[PDB]
Amino acid sequence: NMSLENVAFNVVNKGHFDGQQGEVPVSIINNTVYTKVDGVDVELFENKTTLPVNVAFELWAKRNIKPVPEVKILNNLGVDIAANTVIWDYKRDAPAHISTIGVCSMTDIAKKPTETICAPLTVFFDGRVDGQVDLFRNARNGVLITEGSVKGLQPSVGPKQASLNGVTLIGEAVKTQFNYYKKVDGVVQQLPETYFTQSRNLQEFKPRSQMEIDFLELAMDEFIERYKLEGYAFEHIVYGDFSHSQLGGLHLLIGLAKRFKESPFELEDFIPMDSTVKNYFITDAQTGSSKCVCSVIDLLLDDFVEIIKSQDLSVVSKVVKVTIDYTEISFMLWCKDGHVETFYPKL
């Protein structure tokens, strides 16, 4: 089933593709879809993807509008494709996956995940949709989310937050914390113990523990004393050092949030996509201190403190692996004389 004009009718009348019958007049010009409303053209969609404009329009209209896992989580779990839905990537304004199953005649590689062409792909299955748990049970490769127990399968508890129409949130009127399951070549995997990033943003950062409240409210020296952090280089790593040409440290989102509340700065997101670790070209407006590649992660401060306090500090430099968002993140740890000098993630 295909029809540009019917996709546009659904967008106009239902806000997204909803399977309704109808058609509206459509114009395509300069990667933009328009529809005619009382004699004039109104823009419905501007294509920012590398797909043809009318195809991208249809996949966007058919996006999943329930809370879904953030794209960084699906990527870290190796998801290739989704069963009978589109995960829209709002960080890239594009489909999270290249191909589809049972969504769109231009992009489908299959109608159902049970077709042979899907067996080697890691298919994303959504236990909230009837039949999909059983499709996972029969799939060779897959990732399954559920809201509850699955008989015979041990769950991994996922992050508290999920994405709902591009808004990352911890649901109160809707469930956003899923159980996760994964199969590789027919065999159910044990997913690793993992930390999770918190997916917050600078502008409306909110503390999620008493330590984070204290970090935002106390002066640096008072906080470090109260939590006994002498010798872990929080002054550099978390608070940031703005005294030299190259900006020192500043690798934890909460420290950017604290600075940003007193003093604005520029973050150039030069690889704009969803990932567990983000790299920014940062320029501090007050001092002129700057750094071309400043890796930034949003861990709960208590989690970051546990990680850094769980390392051996006896060697000048080494790689530290930390499971975060189900993937192995490498950190560089630099020490001198038994104390930390710096500790920072790599992307």
Next chain:
Amino acid sequence: NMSLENVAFNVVNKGHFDGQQGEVPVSIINNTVYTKVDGVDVELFENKTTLPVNVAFELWAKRNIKPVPEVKILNNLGVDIAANTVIWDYKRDAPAHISTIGVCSMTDIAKKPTETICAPLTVFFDGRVDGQVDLFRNARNGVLITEGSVKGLQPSVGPKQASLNGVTLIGEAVKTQFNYYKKVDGVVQQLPETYFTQSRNLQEFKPRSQMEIDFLELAMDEFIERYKLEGYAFEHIVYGDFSHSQLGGLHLLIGLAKRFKESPFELEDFIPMDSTVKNYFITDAQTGSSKCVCSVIDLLLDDFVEIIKSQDLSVVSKVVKVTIDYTEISFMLWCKDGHVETFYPKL
């Protein structure tokens, strides 16, 4: 009279087309107009319309820069075309009307509104321009605005606000409240009694009555008690219900403004144009409550209260017609046992 380079000279030197002689060097690339300033190119206009870039540039330069009726009002009155001006639609970044009269050689269907080709079109006439009241008196079909009395014609008092270079405002240094007149097939119409929407926006919403002040400052239960609104379902319709998966009610702009001051949310304007009723795909960031098509109108709260208190509540569901911005808006009214359950506009 036509000249791309002369249009650009006026934009550069006068801020808009002002009839001055002169030329500057112009480049056209990728729907953008540039001019050369001391050896480098500077962007003057990016075309967002479905017209050719150089044509859209000229119509934008020739836009009316006095306060003019909002486009939703002209549309509701059936205006097809403007006499010797361009009403620029800043919600669509495009001309409000497809064709012109005496503006642009590529888009003109006539030089003067008296030409035969204009007789069946509803032409917009502006009494602030010499001769246009008399052109209206002789036109078969038209809408006329004035700042004052017209001899022999009974006026309809329009909204307080108008649009000045895309800023909607109630003029204090300039007049924005017009008298309105309309002719159909040579016959002066009696325009209907109408409410008017208030054209406010979320970010800088300002109350315009003591009831609206009270609504913003009081708690829900205190407000409802003080204005005796028990049984009219304001809890649902106006304040919004964020307790379930689907966001309940929230159909009045002032209730979105109250929520927005305490708690942010996402409004997807998926049909971006000026209209009396707007539809948004809304996602509440705090709760995750959401709704694909949430119709929203900005009526003065006192007006909305008068409307809902003027309905018969004895039937499960029915259509209620309300004249707003000169057009008949349909509302669905749902009642149970003599009280309101919900009441919401349709677009």
Next chain:
Amino acid sequence: NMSLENVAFNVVNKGHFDGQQGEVPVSIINNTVYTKVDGVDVELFENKTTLPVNVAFELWAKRNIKPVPEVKILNNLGVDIAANTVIWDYKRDAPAHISTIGVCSMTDIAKKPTETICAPLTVFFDGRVDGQVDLFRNARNGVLITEGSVKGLQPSVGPKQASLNGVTLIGEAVKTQFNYYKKVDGVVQQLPETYFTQSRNLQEFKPRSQMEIDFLELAMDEFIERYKLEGYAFEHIVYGDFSHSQLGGLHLLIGLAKRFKESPFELEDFIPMDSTVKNYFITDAQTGSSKCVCSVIDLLLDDFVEIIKSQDLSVVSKVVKVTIDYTEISFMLWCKDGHVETFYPKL
């Protein structure tokens, strides 16, 4: 169920729009329409019009595939729009008319030509389609073609040739010669007595009378003697003068055909459209003689001879008007001492 994908299905399976049910997947990119065949994209349509790509595609697919008048004839008769068909202009690769009636939801101004919007427009009606003669009688402005008499209407016999899928031809298996009728402001208009151009082209030129045969085969001065053309300046007007830097004469297509056979030249068609008189920037490859604006008409040589011999040769210069293809073509006639100096379509 009209749609882009259904238009494409018809083009792929029927060669044009044929009202058949079905859909194929379509990609829109680079002002081009593709469809997927065995997993790869195949081009169906490259938009050369000023319409949106998907709209132009639909009008092209819905083009009239029966013999229709050449566009130059419809233009000369003042046709603005066609009733329930598309006349495709193969000289411009675009619709002959900007709007439609009952064809396409993006370009329609009406569904039927009886709607009031169509009254000021000259609508083209095709008596080969049921009901269109009656619609012509009810239309305020229009042009009608038929294959036979219409009771009470005075006919004009049209050209022998018509256009079929872009091929101009004199039909043997189909009828290409029509009666023409026209109405202005509600009143049937007498069409003038007229010559018709022959619509031949340079490389496929075939003579159509004994005189044209003799012209192609005889030497210049033999032809002029045999047809008693001394003093009518055929050496200049028809054969052309290549002796000076500016090319002299050469205004009849058959004269270009004679030269071309012997010696090639370049014709720059700098306003590419169908027209009774064409203007070319001509450069002769053998001599270097050239002319920026060389007007060329393809009359039967017998007709041109009749035209020029009917002229009063006693004045130095005068404008001579000849009805050709239903339009008045102005010629300049320059004489001296009772003989022709030159005679050319006036520019």
Next chain:
Amino acid sequence: NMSLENVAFNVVNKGHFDGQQGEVPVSIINNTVYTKVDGVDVELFENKTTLPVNVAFELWAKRNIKPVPEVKILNNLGVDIAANTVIWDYKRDAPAHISTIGVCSMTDIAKKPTETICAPLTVFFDGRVDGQVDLFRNARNGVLITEGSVKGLQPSVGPKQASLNGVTLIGEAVKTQFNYYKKVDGVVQQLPETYFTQSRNLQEFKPRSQMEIDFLELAMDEFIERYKLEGYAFEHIVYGDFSHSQLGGLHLLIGLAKRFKESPFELEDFIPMDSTVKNYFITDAQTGSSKCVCSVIDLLLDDFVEIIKSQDLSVVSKVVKVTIDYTEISFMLWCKDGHVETFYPKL
């Protein structure tokens, strides 16, 4: 050191990608690749594909420049992708296959065809390249061409002709006739006995047997008598019937070649791709006879005669299947009273 500028260096200096070191400056604009030569831009490549301009440029530069199977043959054998080369499709001006193996970092799905991702795809292998026979034996799905025997493998002799830089030819200084082999699901598949189309074109048509010579030179009824073809409806099927508005028959390329020599006609190639049977919208310029979907195949006339004379003429209508270019082509055969009425590729 693969790069855009190095691809362009190779095109400029070697005519195609040849693995040479070096770079030239490149400009990308308007879906076109330019390079700077003596201070001005010179066009190297105009992208007509649905791939990004710089990607399509690289695949075109890396096209196989030896004789390769025509695309219609590879399509009919189910080829999905090629091992370490690009088969350029000169009928579509685009790669024959969407993905690559070991060619281009933007389109590669693998570096070697032994990778697991390639197992479900039918990979084209070229025995003229070292190692590719062994890769075919290890591939689950594939098509192999060679110039000689492969031990133990049962060959199919392919067409005489192949494509060299877009020129279809029967090689004299190079070998163009290959053995073909195919594997499905790990098992070598017997290729069917098959006719081959001749890949000739209308204007350069040359006969290839005594019968085709006689067909081009004799009058219709002489040819039919000499080759005893009475009752096989060659008048309709091969010579074509131009007497009615719908063009009758004309399904063999040699019959079009005979007509074209005498009288020109228009062939609209409305699905432009390489195919065993082609469909055209044909308009005869002399008569006006036309047909929207005229299927045309270029068989050696001797083969077509053998095919139609082998048919049972005792049923009113039946579907006749003939293997041509390794694919099953369905023909409709219509008979009456023991003679052929018509016989055409089924649509």
Next chain:
Amino acid sequence: NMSLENVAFNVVNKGHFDGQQGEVPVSIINNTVYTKVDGVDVELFENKTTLPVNVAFELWAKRNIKPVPEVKILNNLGVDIAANTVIWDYKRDAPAHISTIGVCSMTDIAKKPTETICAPLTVFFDGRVDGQVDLFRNARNGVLITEGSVKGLQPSVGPKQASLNGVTLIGEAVKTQFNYYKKVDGVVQQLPETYFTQSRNLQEFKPRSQMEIDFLELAMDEFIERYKLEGYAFEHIVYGDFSHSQLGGLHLLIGLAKRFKESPFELEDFIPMDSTVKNYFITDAQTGSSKCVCSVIDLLLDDFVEIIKSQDLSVVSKVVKVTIDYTEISFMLWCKDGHVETFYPKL
């Protein structure tokens, strides 16, 4: 009053820019310039340059329409820019030079060539325009053409042919042979003695001496005997060797012309520009012999014979430099035992 609309008026009414007053309505879309004629858009110009569409349109309209040197000559003489004219390059569909002097406000670097910015550039001056000889004498770097002597300046007689509106020709009604002069760093430079290429093309090739007539008409071994060319490898160099997979020799255009008459082949012009020596990827359709880089020059056969017979045949290999079109062309000469093996433009 220069403007886009005035340039378009001149193109429509005069065939090119002619300084006339007037305007027409213009639409810019898809790198194309349209104008409105009887209510529909007609294409005037498709931009194939790397300049903005409206700028390229103006330079094309302002092209020199008198005979001018071929671009290959101006390039070989080092011309950077022209004084107060545009040399249009019809091989690239683009201006021959990037900047202008006194032509176009977007591309001008100066209004007059006497301005200081022009001193380092080699400016082309045209003695047929009043004042330009004097400007050449005042210019630091320049190239001058005239139709006659300039007092005290030592002339170089140029090629017989010139380009007129893109047609290369030897003028009979106009003069195409010029005197050439050149200045470097303020000093008049002696131009070298030189051959000239003939600028013929493959399909319109006409011989220009008795030897070229004999070459086209005689069999290979007769020609070689009659002109005493044994031991000079004309079999290879001129006639070409099609017996091996790599095509041998074939470096003279007349030899391609002889082959083409008998048997067609494909020439891929993979660097499309005007050049004294052209390189083609050639594929012979009859044999399959091909060559990726086949250098081709169009010398009069008599000149090439004189060149190769003047060579010392006693060394195995050597670089031979010949001045052609004022530039030094390197040839490789390979000999063995006192006879030529091959002789070709060095790559």
